C-alpha cells in the first residue's frame, strides 16, 4: 500500500530526518523564520505604529522588528486574502499581516517540532522526556504571544517580534502590570535562574571529578563513547558537596530528573502569571500598604517607591506607545520629581 | 470478601519528605504576603 | 495593620495540610517491617 511506502520514504534515515511530523514542521518553521527575516529588512511599521522597523529604513539588528498590527484590526487573523488586505500583498504588509503570519505559522511549527521529538523518540525507542520538557516553551509562546493579547484589546499589545521591540514589552509590563511583583513571575525566574545554576554547577562538578583514563592533560579524548564505567567519580562528588554545602546528590537518575523539573516548572509558572495578566488580573498592589500610605505621609517602603516609578513609565510612555488613543498630556500634568 | 489483588504499598523516603517540606514551606513564604494582601 | 482576616488561616492550612500529608506517609513508610 502506498501509505506504508509514503511512510517508508519519510522515516528514512537521512542527514536531516524528515518524518511525518516534518510535513507540518518544515513548511511552517521555514515560513516563520522567513517572514521574520523578511520584515526585519523590508517591511515597515509606519502605518501600524508610526515606527521605522526595517533595515531598509535604517534600523540596526537591535532596533529592527516585525511590529504588531494596528489596534483597529482588533484580534483579526489578518489573512492575506481576508477583508483587510483583500488579497493584496503590499497592503497586507503595511497592515501588519506579517505578524499574524509569523505568529500563527511559528505556532504550528512548535506543534510540529514537539511531534517530531515524539515521533523520533518512538522510532529510536527512547522515552519522550524531551517532549514533556518542550511543553514549557510551548506554554510560554502560547500564553504570551496568543493568550495574552487575546485578552487585551487586540494583537497590537502582543510582543512585537524584534530585539528592542521586546524590551518595551518588558518595561511595559513593569510599568502597567507591575509584573516583577507577581508570585508567578518570581517562581518563573527562580526556575530559569535556578535552572541555569544546576546547568553550570553540574557541568563543573563533572569536569573536576573525572577519573584519569588517559595520559594527556586535555582529558577530552580520554572518553569512552561506548559506555562501561562512570566517567566521573559520582562517589567523590557526593562527598565534596556533602562537606561544602551540607547537602549533595547521590542518585544520578534523580539529579537528572531534577534538572528537567526545575526549569520546566519555572516556565510553566511564569505562564500562568501572564494568562492572568491577559484579563489584567495582575498582582499590582498590597492593599494594607496603600491604606497606611494614604493616612500616614511618612510611611515609605521600597514598594511605594516602585509604584511611583510605574506612574512615570505609564505617563511618559503611553503617548507614543498607544498612538490609537490620541493621547495629549500637557507638560503640567506629567508627574516629575524635583529638578529632573 | 476476597482480599482485592490490585493493591500495592505506598512509600515516601526521608529525602522526599524533606524535599516536600522545603517546597511547602517556601511556597508559604512566597504566598502568605499576597494572602494577607 | 489593615490586612486580610483570612490571610492567617489561609497561610496556616496552606502549610499544615500538605505537610501533614507528607508526614503521614513518611511515618507509615518508615514503620514498614523489613
Amino acid at each position: 500500500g502506498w501509505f506504508d511506502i509514503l511512510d517508508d520514504w519519510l522515516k528514512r534515515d537521512r542527514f536531516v530526518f524528515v518524518g511525518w511530523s516534518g510535513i507540518l514542521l518544515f513548511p511552517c518553521a521555514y515560513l516563520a523564520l522567513g517572514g521574520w527575516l523578511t520584515g526585519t529588512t523590508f517591511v515597515t511599521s509606519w502605518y501600524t505604529h508610526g515606527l521605522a522597523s526595517s533595515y531598509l529604513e535604517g534600523c540596526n539588528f537591535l532596533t529592527v522588528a516585525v511590529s504588531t498590527p494596528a489596534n483597529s484590526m482588533g484580534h483579526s487573523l489578518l489573512l492575506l486574502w481576508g477583508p483587510e488586505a483583500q488579497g493584496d500583498f503590499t497592503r497586507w504588509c503595511q497592515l501588519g499581516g506579517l505578524w499574524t503570519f509569523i505568529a500563527l505559522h511559528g505556532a504550528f511549527g512548535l506543534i510540529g517540532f514537539m511531534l517530531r521529538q515524539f515521533e523520533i523518540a518512538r522510532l529510536v525507542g527512547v522515552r519522550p522526556y524531551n517532549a514533556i520538557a518542550f511543553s514549557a516553551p510551548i506554554a510560554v509562546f502560547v500564553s504570551v504571544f496568543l493568550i495574552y493579547p487575546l485578552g487585551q484589546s487586540s494583537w497590537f499589545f502582543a510582543p512585537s517580534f524584534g530585539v528592542a521591540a521586546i524590551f518595551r514589552f518588558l518595561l511595559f509590563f513593569q510599568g502597567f502590570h507591575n509584573w516583577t511583583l507577581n508570585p508567578f513571575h518570581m517562581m518563573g525566574v527562580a526556575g530559569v535562574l535556578g535552572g541555569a545554576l544546576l546547568c553550570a554547577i553540574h557541568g563543573a562538578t563533572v569536569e573536576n571529578t573525572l577519573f584519569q583514563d588517559g595520559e594527556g592533560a586535555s582529558t577530552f579524548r580520554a572518553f569512552n563513547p561506548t559506555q562501561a564505567e562512570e566517567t566521573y567519580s559520582m562517589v567523590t562528588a557526593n562527598r565534596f558537596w556533602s562537606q561544602i554545602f551540607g547537602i549533595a546528590f547521590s542518585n544520578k537518575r534523580w539529579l537528572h530528573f531534577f534538572m528537567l523539573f526545575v526549569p520546566v516548572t519555572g516556565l510553566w509558572m511564569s505562564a500562568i502569571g501572564v494568562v492572568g495578566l491577559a484579563l489584567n488580573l495582575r498582582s499590582y498592589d498590597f492593599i494594607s500598604q496603600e491604606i497606611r500610605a494614604a493616612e500616614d505621609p511618612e510611611f515609605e517602603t521600597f514598594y511605594t517607591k516602585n509604584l511611583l516609578l510605574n506612574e512615570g513609565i505609564r505617563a511618559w510612555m503611553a503617548p507614543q506607545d498607544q498612538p490609537h488613543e490620541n493621547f495629549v498630556f500637557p507638560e503640567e500634568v506629567l508627574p516629575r520629581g524635583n529638578a529632573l | 470478601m476476597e482480599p482485592n489483588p490490585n493493591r500495592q504499598p505506598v512509600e515516601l523516603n526521608r529525602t522526599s519528605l524533606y524535599l516536600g517540606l522545603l517546597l511547602i514551606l517556601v511556597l508559604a513564604l512566597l504566598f502568605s504576603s499576597y494572602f494577607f494582601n | 495593620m489593615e490586612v486580610n482576616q483570612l490571610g492567617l488561616i489561609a497561610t496556616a492550612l496552606f502549610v499544615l495540610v500538605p505537610s501533614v500529608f507528607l508526614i503521614i506517609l513518611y511515618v507509615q513508610t518508615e514503620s514498614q517491617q523489613k
Binding site: 562517589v235 | 529525602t15 514551606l25 | 490586612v3 490571610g7
Partner: peptide, 30 residues
C-alpha cells in the same frame, strides 16, 4: 500577627535545613 507568621515559616525553613544536613539518610555505597 503577620510578622509572627513570616518569622515562623522562616524559623521552620531553618529547622528543616538543620535536619536535612545533619539527619539525612547516610548515603550508602554499592
Amino acid at each position: 500577627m503577620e510578622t509572627i507568621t513570616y518569622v515562623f515559616i522562616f524559623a521552620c525553613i531553618i529547622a528543616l535545613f538543620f535536619f536535612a544536613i545533619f539527619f539525612r539518610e547516610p548515603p550508602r555505597i554499592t
